[PDB]
Structure 1
Amino acid sequence: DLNKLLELWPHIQEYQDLALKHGINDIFQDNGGKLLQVLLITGLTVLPGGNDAVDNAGQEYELKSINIDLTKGFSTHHHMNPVIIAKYRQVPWIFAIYRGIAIEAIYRLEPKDLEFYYDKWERKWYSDGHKDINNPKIPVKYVMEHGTKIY
């Protein structure tokens, strides 16, 4: 096994080198090694931790990821309210689907594809007497059904 490390490490360092070039300081923390795949495939640039990335034309995106083996719904925001929703409405969303550490598929939804949920939650907020919804999920079936498959 220690032999395996000597044979595998050189490639690992090269992967980290590639990660650094794209603004990922440590591939072994906070899904660093996973985010990199999405960035390279999609050609986006990461933004400082709101919107998570931007393309060469200056279009900002909201990025959501999921481990298909652990859950079946993308998370949004723990304290969902009209302020956040207003922000969400302005940008297209990138949905990344992983299986383990590997990227399996990537979908893009335009704001109009998410209005259904935006309107629903927004009405929810006012009807329940101004109560923040706890991280409402977006079914993977929904994204696969309404988004464009980039990968």
Structure 2
Amino acid sequence: SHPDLNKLLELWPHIQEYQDLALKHGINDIFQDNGGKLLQVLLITGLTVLPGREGNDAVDNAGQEYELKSINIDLTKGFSTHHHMNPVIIAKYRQVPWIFAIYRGIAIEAIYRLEPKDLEFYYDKWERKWYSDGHKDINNPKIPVKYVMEHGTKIY
């Protein structure tokens, strides 16, 4: 018997509880694909995760679907969007608001929401580009956190 194993005995009851709660909200393994993270935003925002692959993310009770980006303010300063961006992708992203999650570690610090118009400045640009470069795709253009803090609504 030692210090840590006592910490595992002590803490584990709650961890199993956190996982149970994660299953109810559709997340099998909190220790895998940032499940332990995606859940905070879900619980914090009353949203529901959509299966599929990597198209539309969450959806509320009203059925309004959402796009959902996450960032670790300790490591990055812009959100990923799509490594292969063309006018079809952009055509889809301009129909649903995006939920931006800002984590510092595994802990959530803030959450903003940009409406389709609030990202328009980026859509019309990434599109005018796709043409100029000669029908060439953009490799994961990034939206600056500064941009989202100044344009979106802070939900958390």
> Structure 1 segments of 4 or more deviating over 4 A?
none
Q: TM-score, normalised by structure 1?
A: 0.99
Which residue matches 1:9?
12
Give per-residue Cα distances to partners, 1:95-150, cap 9 Å, x unaligned: 00000000000000000000000000000001110000100000000000000000
Query: For each residue in 1:48-82, what CA deviation from the matched residue of structure 2 results, as whole angstroms up to 9, or x when unmatched?
Result: 13111000000000000000000000010000100
Unaligned residue ranges in structure 1 (runs of 5+): none
Aligned equivalents of 2:88 and 2:79: distance in 1?
Answer: 20
- TM-score for both structures, normalised by structure 2: 0.96
Q: Distance in 1 between matches of 2:76 and 2:33?
A: 18
Aligned equivalents of 1:48 and 1:86: distance in 2?
21
Cα RMSD, aligned residues only = 0.4
How far apart, in 2, do the equivalents of 1:77 and 1:45 lie?
22
* Distance of 2:35 and 2:44 partners within structure 1: 15
CA deviations 1:14-73 (Å, max 9, x no partner) are 000000000000000010000000000100000013111000000000000000000000
Q: CA deviation at 1:13?
A: 0.2
Question: Could you tell me how far apart the structure 1 residues matched to 2:69 and 2:95 are?
Answer: 16
Counterpart secondary structure, 2:66: strand
List gaps (5 residues or longer) in structure 2. Answer: none
Match of 2:28 among 25, 30, 53: 25
What secondary structure does 1:60 align onto? coil
Q: Report the secondary structure of 1:90's partner residue.
A: coil
Q: Which residue in 2 is equivalent to 1:56?
A: 61
> How far apart, CA to CA, are the structure 2 residues paired with 1:52 and 1:80?
17
